[PDB]
Amino acid sequence: VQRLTYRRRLSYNTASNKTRLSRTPGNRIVYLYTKKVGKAPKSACGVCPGRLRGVRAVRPKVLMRLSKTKKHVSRAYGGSMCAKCVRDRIKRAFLIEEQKIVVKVLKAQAQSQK
Amino acid sequence: AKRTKKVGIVGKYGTRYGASLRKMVKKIEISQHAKYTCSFCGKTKMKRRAVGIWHCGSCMKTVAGGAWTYNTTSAVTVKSAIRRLKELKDQ
Amino acid sequence: PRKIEEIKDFLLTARRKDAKSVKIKKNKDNVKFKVRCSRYLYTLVITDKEKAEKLKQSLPPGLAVKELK
């Protein structure tokens, strides 16, 4: 039975203290520090709770060390908004633009009559 | 099989806090535990988040409704009064 | 540490300027060449003894060669 002791001065059950168990080459068991892992970045839409894939869910201080394609994906609005909401905004853009064209035609007809 | 005779969701409380008080509270408790049908989709997905707010599972659209119930009779009369004032303004 | 797969990359690594010291680990059925660069310790595992004996002569003379026991 590995009756372990402390190594640092922090004695209490602190939530910052996150360790894991691993076997040493010297055939004894001691803790190793787990790196702090964050969540995946959520899209800027808000209506879709599905987080984006292809991005390492990690502490965002690693993003200064990561490369450019590792940070953002090669897609329009990369790593900011999902392509479903992008094409929904494009459909809304085209439909409201054609509606404004119809309103312009009706305004031209209103100026033609009165 | 038959669980209880006449008591319902207040039956987990038991002998405490009287009979008529629990009988009065039961009508509000069943009305808040029974989910309502949405207007956009129509599916019974309106989950009670907190007071004056309702969350939908299918549409994912927050609807600010009543405290305990979804639509009150007072809100129906307010909507009818707004309809009447709109028709009176339109003439 | 990293592993060099081909003989040509190992020769281009051994002919560098910052090559400190190579060592030879002679275990059974394998000859491990370990070259000490600045960042990694680059290793070459050769299972053929005749190819390893040819490569040991193919080492350049301007390098600290040591056979580890």
Binding site: - | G52, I53, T62, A64, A67, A75, A81, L85 | -
Partner: protein, 239 residues
């Protein structure tokens, strides 16, 4: 008590819901904003909602906090101004609306950005208008009719969260957490059980009052405890 103990504890409740700043766009125009999301704010019983506007001169994404009305949804265009149409969730001046309109978040004076009648399930009712010199009689939920100078603006509809005090309190375990969230004055102690050296109604061996509970309005501090200038008492007969 004077302070630092009986005060309401406000830590997670951030900010307050204020009415939009007046300008020419609220004087003789209108403008459209969107509803972002509604959320139950801590402390206040009624939930709040984010209403996003834009500045006509600048280019920052503005936001405004309003009281959430009953029967409203997120992702909706809200117009606001004098020339706006009549619908649910629309702030507009009182001189444009007709009489008999259920409004809330009303101003007692033009400029204070909304004070009267904006709690959980409350609305003030406009009785009648006056075209000359801009006067308006508005009945408050107490019953009194106040005269308002008709320069203010108010939204349309009742406040969401109506009928919260109809059900009695279930248990003291819920009551302890509720009053711990609200304000630390819940263990209400009887003044007879209190000591006579601090509370005036204390003292004596038996549990008796022995003095009239009615008190004059002209009274200093320490004595002024009880029914303050009670005209009548007991069961309310009729109105």
């Amino acid at each position: 008590g004077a302070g630092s103990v009986f005060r309401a504890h406000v830590k997670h409740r951030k900010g307050a819901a204020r009415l939009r700043a007046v300008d020419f766009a609220e004087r003789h125009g209108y403008i459209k904003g969107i509803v972002k999301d509604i959320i139950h704010d801590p402390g206040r019983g009624a939930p709040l909602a984010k209403v996003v506007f834009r500045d006509p001169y600048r280019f920052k994404k503005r936001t405004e906090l309003f009281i959430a009305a009953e029967g409203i949804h997120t992702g909706q265009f809200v117009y606001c101004g004098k020339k706006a149409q009549l619908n649910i969730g629309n702030v507009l001046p009182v001189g444009t609306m007709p009489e008999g309109t259920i409004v809330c978040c009303l101003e007692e004076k033009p400029g204070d950005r909304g004070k009267l009648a904006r709690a959980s399930g409350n609305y003030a009712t406009v009785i009648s208008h006056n075209p000359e010199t801009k006067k308006t009689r508005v009945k408050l939920p107490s019953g009194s009719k106040k005269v308002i100078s008709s320069a203010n603006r108010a939204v349309v509809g009742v406040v969401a969260g109506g009928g919260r005090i109809d059900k009695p309190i279930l248990k003291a375990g819920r009551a302890y957490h509720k009053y711990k969230a609200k304000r630390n004055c819940w263990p209400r102690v009887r003044g007879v059980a209190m000591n006579p050296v601090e509370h005036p109604f204390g003292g004596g061996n038996h549990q008796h009052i022995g003095k009239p509970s009615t008190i004059r309005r002209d009274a200093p501090a320490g004595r002024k405890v009880g029914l303050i200038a009670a005209r009548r008492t007991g069961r309310l007969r009729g109105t």
